[model samples]
Target: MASISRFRGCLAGALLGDCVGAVYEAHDTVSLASVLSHVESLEPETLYYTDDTAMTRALVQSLLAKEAFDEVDMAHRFAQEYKKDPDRGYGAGVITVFKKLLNPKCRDVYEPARAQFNGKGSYGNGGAMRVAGISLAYSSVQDVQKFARLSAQLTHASSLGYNGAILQALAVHLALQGVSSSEHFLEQLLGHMEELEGDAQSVLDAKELGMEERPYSSRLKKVGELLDQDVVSREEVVSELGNGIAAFESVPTAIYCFLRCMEPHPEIPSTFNSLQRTLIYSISLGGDTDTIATMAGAIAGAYYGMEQVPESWQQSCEGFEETDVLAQSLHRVFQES
Candidate 1:
């Protein structure tokens, strides 16, 4: 059976990261202490989730309803949810695609996304941000990649967008398997992503820039090397891994945060446990805080599960119970299969 805590942890952690991390979205600079203060104590001002959690909830709901991946059913869920509440911090570009998808005459579900950026499509991080649930629903890695790619392509036809989604799902999938060594985690992701090269626009684009064939693998290897270090600065991390809204910019950064914070860092508050440190460290990166933290939290949740996430932090978030419930539904579905 799939481990309940890990399953619950992954979703609940994503929600927690989104709700708290949303506090720092779009910031150019931030300090560890200020970000820590924002998340350290509970507040009555309900922590509202951004499009990260909102879309994620929709993805999990679609999975529960369909009991398998259905592109149209998932597309409808994405459109309907966005229509119900359009102001959850969705990117203007993504909002346009969602609006187009709502049209009754819309035929190909992927058309709206393909029509974006004048056919270049979005390389935005939206695809990966909401992909954690897929990691939990399926047992095999191949299934994870297939479903993750299809899900992402619904809104991000570009290989950069969908490939980033695959990378994020693979991170959660590997963590869900209970691997302990950081090297093992890094290598598996590197090898799988290396194999995904031909299908990845990020890698193809990098090649055009005279870069290597496997861009994500190179980044993952860098993440591994960073994990071996004792300390790293915020500026260095951002400069190297990037912290922007693009999938290529933020996804790998989040993965690095989850891996590096496995033990502890001197810059992070000592009182905070590993999981708290992970979320806080993610927010400390500044730009695109919520999404980065949400992605990092999914990885951390799969690695540590719910047992390690503090109750105080969980209670502070608005939709913890619902996320936990959805996680259970996912777990039960996984068990049945």
Candidate 2:
């Protein structure tokens, strides 16, 4: 068996974890808790990932193929893939983004197309949700923001959405560089966010966006506590962040948890264990298990490399030797920059 290092493991772990949680995303927390104690495999089925991983797949594909953001191409890929696999279970707004991408002539309606959703462009956690791969694709904050934006524009042109994606990328980027201090890591990201300030000014204002003049000090007191507990309940964390179908509520917030562990870096005993526990927590939270799993997986993948993944899952994550393709794609993008 080809080994799974933590770098890639974090990414693959996320994919597998998100897939495992796929079977139970919409179920109530109480219901999911029934299997919480011992759900090595989510439910009885070979879990199918939902919109979270589906969109994430689109992101990795976009980066590996172009090594740059191509809006039309990205939207096109999303449309083709979504059309091909409706079983992937995309969220409503994402489904609409796919349709707009496929429009033969009026494809100019892509970005603004999201506005049709009752004038509220998606502030979804979608952008931030699949950003771990972007971390590997770039070594600098500029490229991270560039690719993150390119990737974010796919279904989330909302300011909050795009900035949120940048935030996730920053989180992962700093983690890759071995960010050991919340003050240093977040200050660096806060500086970047401040620099790009206007990209989503309007939408962020709509969402009451607060510009970061200071470091992101809020998370240290909240989601940062995951390290002390062996098995943190994700449902509880989701409840804390409001997992009500908004990407803002789930995705970036999930990255916050991952960063909390990594912010302390060498101090973190086992990135894999914390991430695995976090994924389980994400699924147990009920509503957005796949998205949460995706976020947590990203954290794990960036920190641990790819070798730490379980033998069985790493073996079958691609559903019969397909994991290698995605892994290679990630490797290509990861090393490209």
Candidate 3:
């Protein structure tokens, strides 16, 4: 069915976005303009992936492996994946926690054992950047919110982290449900935020995107307006929103990028254009270009689906396996489903 194809397409599409967009991470608008000055010849350095894609792969693998969104499964997968590949571009906080996870004293590695930040741990955007797959593997808004929180707790475990997952997942939910017009999107999203004011912690937290019941789209538009102001710098973007280090600001900012360009206008560009724009934009914002690109890639993947991606690109991913067992196993799962 086209739905399955589209999902597969999203996976491939995400990889392409990550690969291509990593070329232009966090810089000034002028610097980004210079980096992306040439429009079409975008070559990537062997599928450059960041913490976003790395964490995303962990999420998808956990989702597929467990068949249900259980926090334990997710935590195990997260810890295991990070342990197996600590060298795979990671945040300092997360990498240190994972190294602790490799030790026997700490049963849960999600909390940084020796974090110098007074054991504050991370509440960064990492949780949000990796949330797209969960949002996509569903058709229900409720489901998206549920799974987002489930996975968010694995690392973030904070109210901010929980909120991050819910909002971004909702964005994916609403987008997949065909709600994209700027005005309508704001109305409906805010309406739900009000309606679900008491549904669940995740949804309730999602509703907190604005001050005093304003529409989610309005707040997103405000962010859009801010981004449009040419005087802003990468420092400002990170200073305000924070690079997706934990959960709160990182993921929501990603959602804002998608929401701003929801319409297929001349400003939106083609699929390639969307990927490049978000990557450049996130990079120009500075601090966490890979995570931003990964989050941006996930959004583009969701919107464009598998058809918009190139086959050769999919074949080019360099993940290792036992006689291509990972690929074959995924195929088996797809067939089973």
Candidate 4:
């Protein structure tokens, strides 16, 4: 698979997964059958994305416009997007940051985010949710991690949040290397992540009580163990891997979703290709559905390429066309860089 196709797949697939997963947000007791039946035929035009795609679009737009990662430009785009549509299911703390950004007196751009929650800032998946574009825009793994960390810090100042963003991008970066041994794939990912988790300087706002950071490397180890299982329960996955707003909870879950469904599950329709299966499996895990599936879709998309995404899905989703354009734009940058 060409790298460009993987780029296209990662962004477009993240959008599709977010659209579908948005349908089931905040509903934990729903069955797989109910969720599956609901997605049988999507009203693509009607199913608009929440903060995930909106924020993700802003990130890509800024990156493409600058041809480099400009924190100032990116911050403006995020605040601009939030100001334009504040009702996109945005978290309260993040909304405050956006509101603060609107102030003319706000000289320090990071102030709003830094002031959030008594200077602790948010550890939510808000950062990781929009980070797939970071992976697609940059080529080297080091660049991906560095930029992904900065990208996360624009809203999420906590170490867990930024580290999750790095882990999410690392998964996409590793997947872009083409299909290989699942063990080796995971080993390489873990190695990079261990370095990220241990970096003392990476922790920007360490406010979690009795802990320095959320031990991302340990969650990643759990992800590896869960992937090795023959059958893992949705409840078990939720309990062990988590399905919450916290980056510690959802990012690893998203990784598990991609690895587990590398082969199609029996319950899922065989007609669905690997990318579709990956989305379905991610959504089936269900808590923080949109973000988890969006993250999972990015990884799966990179592995399967754009050709694997369904035509109807591509046609129906809101950001599909734009994501395709941005994917190509990023691919050009990726090639040049």
Best by lDDT: 1
Give candidate 4 regions above 4 Å deviation: 43-45, 201-207, 210-214
Q: Is candidate 2 or candidate 4 better by TM-score?
A: 4
lDDT of 2 by residue, 1-337 (tens): 1222434565676676677666667666634345453354422335556666676677668767887666666667777888988876666777777776677765563555456456546777777777666776677788888878767766777665666677777767765665546456556755665566544554354445343421122332344454445554555566555554565566545665555444333322343365555555556566766776677667656565554455655554544245446656665556533
Each model's total of backbone clashes: 0, 25, 16, 0
* TM-scores vs. true structure, each candidate: 0.95, 0.77, 0.71, 0.94
What does candidate 4's lDDT look like per residue over 1-337, in tens digits? Answer: 6888888898888888888888778667657787677667753345688899999989999998998899989998999999998888887778888888888888877778777778876788999999988888887888998999898988988777878888898888888877557778778777887777666644444434344454566777888888878888889888887888888888888888888888878888888888888887778877788889889988888888889988887777776888899889988875644
lDDT of each: 0.86, 0.60, 0.55, 0.82
Error of 3 at 239 (Å): 8.1
State candidate 3's TM-score.
0.71
Query: Which residue pairs clash within candidate 1?
Result: none
Which parts of model 1 are misplaced by more than 4 Å?
Answer: 199-213
- Residue 335 accuracy (lDDT) in model 1: 49
Using TM-score, give the best candidate's number.
1
Summarize candidate 1's per-residue lDDT along 169-248 as a digit string, tens digits. 99999888888587788888888888887655666655654656665777887787777767778898888888998887
Deviation from native of the Cα of residue 31 in model 2, angstroms? 7.6
Summarize candidate 3's per-residue lDDT along 213-259 as a digit string, tens digits.
Answer: 32233445455565456555555655555554555446646655555
